[PDB]
Structure formats: structure tokens, C-alpha cells
Design an enzyme around this catalytic site. Structure first.
Site, short mmCIF file in Angstrom:
data_model
loop_
_atom_site.label_atom_id
_atom_site.label_comp_id
_atom_site.label_asym_id
_atom_site.label_seq_id
_atom_site.Cartn_x
_atom_site.Cartn_y
_atom_site.Cartn_z
N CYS A 181 -27.74 1.76 -34.68
CA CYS A 181 -26.58 1.48 -33.88
C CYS A 181 -25.97 0.17 -34.39
O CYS A 181 -25.26 0.19 -35.38
CB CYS A 181 -27.05 1.37 -32.44
SG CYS A 181 -25.70 1.48 -31.24
N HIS B 171 -29.37 6.92 -31.66
CA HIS B 171 -30.74 6.43 -31.52
C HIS B 171 -31.66 7.59 -31.81
O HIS B 171 -31.94 8.39 -30.91
CB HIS B 171 -31.01 5.90 -30.11
CG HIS B 171 -30.37 4.59 -29.80
ND1 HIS B 171 -29.16 4.49 -29.13
CD2 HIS B 171 -30.77 3.32 -30.03
CE1 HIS B 171 -28.84 3.22 -28.98
NE2 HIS B 171 -29.80 2.49 -29.51
N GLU C 29 -34.90 7.62 -32.36
CA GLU C 29 -36.14 7.43 -31.55
C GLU C 29 -36.31 8.42 -30.40
O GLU C 29 -37.42 8.80 -30.06
CB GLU C 29 -36.17 6.07 -30.79
CG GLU C 29 -35.85 4.81 -31.48
CD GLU C 29 -34.38 4.61 -31.70
OE1 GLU C 29 -33.89 5.11 -32.73
OE2 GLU C 29 -33.73 3.94 -30.87
#
EC number: 6.3.4.2
Length: 267
Positions: free
Chosen positions: A104, A231, A233
Site C-alpha cells: 500500500c 493487502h 496478507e
């Protein structure tokens, strides 16, 4: 096992609850290629000149960690704090060809670093914390969706579409034309400034469905230098590690080409 060392250039010098998903994604990737993960946490302000002056011991500790790293990660971020340190971390990874993943804010800083030091756009910046910036390379770009009043932050799951078939990330995601990932950002590469990048090594390989927001970057002539606005993750799991994190650990360990040639099993 063999050890992989990864520098996380962020806000803290140890595991904080804000990086839990990030740690988990790195671990999934590590385990998946039979390496122990040695994650070194670096408070990005320590890498700055100011710290050399006021606390040189911390400064040399930070740089020693950054210089031994097999891979470098600049995750999603908080504020104006330690931005110059992150830019130095990014500069190091770029020029010393160390595997890099920016997420980001880390993608946005990577765009800015390339602009300043490879396109000679010296004052290129984000308007987020300087709205009177001369070269507004990164800017506030709200979505305007049906059923809402006014602009809003780019939030939730969104489709990112690949712009080219020669993207390492496309390969790692299993050669699909698009992906769905989670977003939480409102600042974007300025479309007025994209032309500047066309004859140079940083390419915009992924974009939103409308084509206004550049969401993935890749640097040519580097083993693995990658940025994403989303993101990754939040979709990683033990049996399917988030491809951008997997690619980082692969590249950091020298095993990326082998994984491509075996057919991207974990995608």
C-alpha cells in the site's frame, strides 16, 4: 532448516499486533519452501540521518539489519513518521538488487523513490502530508459508487486486472487475468504523471477495473521488486501462501526460477 532473513521496515523494532497478518503471511511462505523465517523488525526512523546524529548506535544497528537482509518488506503504513527512512530502505533494495515487496504505502513510496532517483523528478511526492506539493505524483482519489453520498475510500474486496502477460505476479497467481484482494487506501498514482514512466524500468502491470488506479508495479532488471496497493496478507493461508509474499521468500532464497519451472504448485 536453512534460514531466510527478511527486514520489515515499519514503525516498531519488534512484533506488534498491527503486523500479525503480515507475520503470518511470511511464515506461510517460509514453511512452504522449507526455510526458517528470521524476521528483523526495523523502526524506519532509525535508518535516517537524524538518528545517526542523535543515536548513532541505533542507526548502525538498523543499517546492519537492513544490509544482512535477503529480502526487504515495507508494509502498510502510519502517517508521515519515518517516511524518509523507508525511502532509503527502498533505495537500498533497488540499487543493491535485494528482493523487495512494497504494500500500500510501501508501493506508493516505491513509485516516489523511482521518480526522484531514476526519472530525476526531484520533488515528486504524495499530497497526503503536503497538499501544496509541486510534483503531485501520489494523490487523493476517492471512489464514487452508487448509493453513497460523496467520495469514499477504496475499501473491501476489489478486482485488480493485469495489463500484461509478462508479469511475475501474474505467474505466481497462477496465470489468471485478474485477482480479488482487500483494499484500504485512498491515495493513488496520479494519472497525469504515468506517461513519464513509459521508457523506464518501472512498469504498471495491474490496475482497477476502470483503469484509473495503478495497483501493481514491477521493476525490470531486478530479480524481484514488487509493489501492490492492496493487502495480500488478508488472503494468505498455510496451503496457499499469498503469492506476493511467496515470491519474496522464493526470490530471497534463490529459488524463484525453480518454482516457476515446477509449475507454480502453491497457486
Amino acid at each position: 532448516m536453512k534460514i531466510c532473513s527478511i527486514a520489515l521496515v515499519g514503525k516498531y523494532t519488534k512484533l506488534r499486533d498491527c503486523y500479525a497478518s503480515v507475520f503470518k503471511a511470511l511464515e506461510h511462505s517460509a514453511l512452504a519452501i522449507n526455510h526458517k523465517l528470521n524476521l528483523m523488525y526495523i523502526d524506519s526512523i532509525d535508518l535516517e540521518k537524524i538518528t545517526e546524529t542523535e543515536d548513532p548506535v541505533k542507526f548502525h544497528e538498523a543499517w546492519q539489519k537492513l544490509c544482512k537482509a535477503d529480502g526487504i518488506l515495507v508494509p502498510g503504513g502510519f502517517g508521515i513518521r519515518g517516511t524518509l527512512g523507508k525511502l532509503q530502505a527502498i533505495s537500498w533494495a533497488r540499487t543493491k538488487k535485494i528482493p523487495f515487496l512494497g504494500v500500500c504505502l510501501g508501493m506508493q513510496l516505491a513509485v516516489i523513490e523511482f521518480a526522484r532517483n531514476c526519472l530525476n523528478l526531484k520533488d515528486a511526492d504524495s499530497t497526503e502530508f503536503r497538499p501544496n506539493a509541486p510534483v503531485p505524483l501520489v494523490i487523493d482519489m476517492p471512489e464514487h459508487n452508487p448509493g453513497n453520498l460523496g467520495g469514499t475510500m477504496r475499501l473491501g474486496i476489489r478486482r485488480t486486472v493485469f495489463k500484461t502477460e509478462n508479469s511475475i505476479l501474474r505467474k505466481l497467481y497462477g496465470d489468471v487475468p485478474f485477482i480479488e484482494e482487500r483494499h484500504r487506501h485512498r491515495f493513488e498514482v496520479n494519472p497525469n504523471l504515468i506517461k513519464q514512466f513509459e521508457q523506464n524500468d518501472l512498469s504498471f502491470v495491474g490496475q482497477d477495473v476502470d483503469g484509473d488506479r495503478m495497483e501493481i508495479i514491477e521493476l525490470a532488471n531486478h530479480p524481484y521488486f514488487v509493489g501492490v496497493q492492496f493487502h495480500p496478507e488478508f488472503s494468505s493461508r498455510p496451503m496457499k501462501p499469498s503469492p506476493p509474499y511467496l515470491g519474496l521468500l522464493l526470490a530471497a532464497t534463490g529459488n524463484l526460477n525453480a518454482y516457476l519451472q515446477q509449475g507454480c504448485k502453491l497457486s
